Paper text:
The SusE-like proteins were found to be composed of a conserved three domain architecture: a partially disordered N-terminal domain that is predicted to be proximal to the membrane and structurally homologous to an FN3-like bundle, a middle β-sandwich domain, and a C-terminal domain homologous to family 32 carbohydrate-binding modules, that bind to galactose. However, functional analyses with BT2857 and BT3158 revealed that the SusE-like proteins exhibited galactosidase activity with para-nitrophenyl-β-D-galactopyranoside and α-(1,4)-lactose substrates, that has not been demonstrated for SusE proteins.
BT3158 crystallized in a C21 space group, with one molecule in the asymmetric unit. Iterative rebuilding and refinement of this region suggested that it is composed mainly of β-strands, consistent with sequence-based homology modeling as an FN3-like bundle domain. This deficiency in electron density across the N-terminal region and sufficient size of the asymmetric unit to accommodate the domains was similar to results seen in the prototypical SusE and Ea domain of BT3700; thereby suggesting this region is consistently disordered and likely forms a discrete domain that would reside close to the membrane and have flexibility independent of the rest of the protein. Beyond the membrane-proximal DUF4959 partially disordered domain, BT3158 presented a distinct two-domain structure, with backbone residues confidently modeled with the exception of an extended loop (166–173). However, this is where the similarities at this region stop in that in BT3158 A304 is in a structurally equivalent position to D304, and none of the other residues between these proteins are conserved in this region suggesting sequence and structural divergence that could also reflect functional variance.
Residue numbers in the entry: 128 to 165, 174 to 401
The structure:
């Protein structure tokens, strides 16, 4: 019966501010998960069941899970005591360029990719990592770096190159991208085999004004850092890629100022 396989194969792991519950359901049956603390009901029929409860402090808490079906069957309780994950800013000094053969180069104009992790950021900053021009027909493009440790990621903050603000939302500022990762050594050829997608991301321009016109709200917003959250169902990772799909001005050029990552080191 699906509800029995569900309770028998269940895994419950800590995640940021709660727990991640996963189980199997190869029949695509309709299961109801009731999750108790001393708080949520999931209604799902996917094959690879995975869902989160959040809102919890990072200390040990007792959790109870029961699975039921639309036929009035109900499982034994699964009990677990788990501590939710709590994020820290990962140590920037361990972040390094990890250049693979099919990556864009980010060492133009006197800087390197590792400039994105040197701490220098904000409206008046001249810091950046700066690529080379390419034809936008070549999007998507990507670059690769090493976090220098393995971590369960929560979120990251991204700053565009600024130089007083007029460079926001043009001149290499990225618009949509994906963040991919892996925990084991990449292949030197830059093959995408062995990489896992971790986040879909879109940098928002609050005003929605065309290229070359930035509002006061746009400039304040970008200078404060753009925040993105990662998927809960991701493995620990060490190596990271940004697969750039688009840029704000549509030109084939990537230029950014800073990237700070948050999560729990392994």
């Amino acid at each position: 019966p699906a509800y029995l396989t569900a309770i028998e194969e269940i895994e419950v792991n800590p995640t940021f501010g709660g727990i991640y519950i996963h189980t199997t359901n190869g029949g695509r049956n309709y299961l109801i998960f009731d999750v108790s603390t001393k708080e949520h009901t999931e209604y799902t029929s996917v094959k690879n069941i995975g869902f989160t409860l959040r809102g919890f402090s990072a200390e040990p808490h007792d959790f109870k899970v029961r699975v039921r079906d639309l036929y009035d069957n109900q499982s034994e309780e699964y009990l677990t005591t788990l501590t939710p994950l709590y994020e820290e800013k990962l140590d920037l000094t361990k972040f390094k360029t990890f250049y693979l053969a099919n990556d864009i180069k980010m060492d133009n104009a006197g800087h390197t990719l590792e400039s994105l992790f040197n701490g220098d950021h904000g409206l008046n900053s001249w810091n950046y990592a700066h690529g080379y021009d390419f034809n936008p027909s070549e999007f998507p493009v990507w670059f690769t770096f090493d976090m220098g440790q393995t971590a369960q990621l929560s979120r990251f903050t991204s700053w565009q190159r600024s130089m007083g603000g007029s460079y926001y939302y043009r001149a290499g500022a990225i618009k949509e991208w994906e963040v991919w990762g892996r925990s084991d050594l990449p292949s030197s050829d830059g093959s995408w085999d062995g990489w896992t997608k971790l986040a879909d991301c879109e940098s928002i321009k609050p005003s929605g004004w065309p290229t070359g016109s930035n509002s006061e709200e746009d400039i304040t917003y970008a200078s404060k850092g753009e925040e993105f959250e990662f998927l809960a169902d991701i493995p620990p990772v060490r190596y990271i890629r940004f697969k750039i799909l688009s840029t704000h001005d549509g030109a084939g050029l990537v230029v950014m100022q800073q990237l700070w990552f948050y999560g729990t080191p392994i």
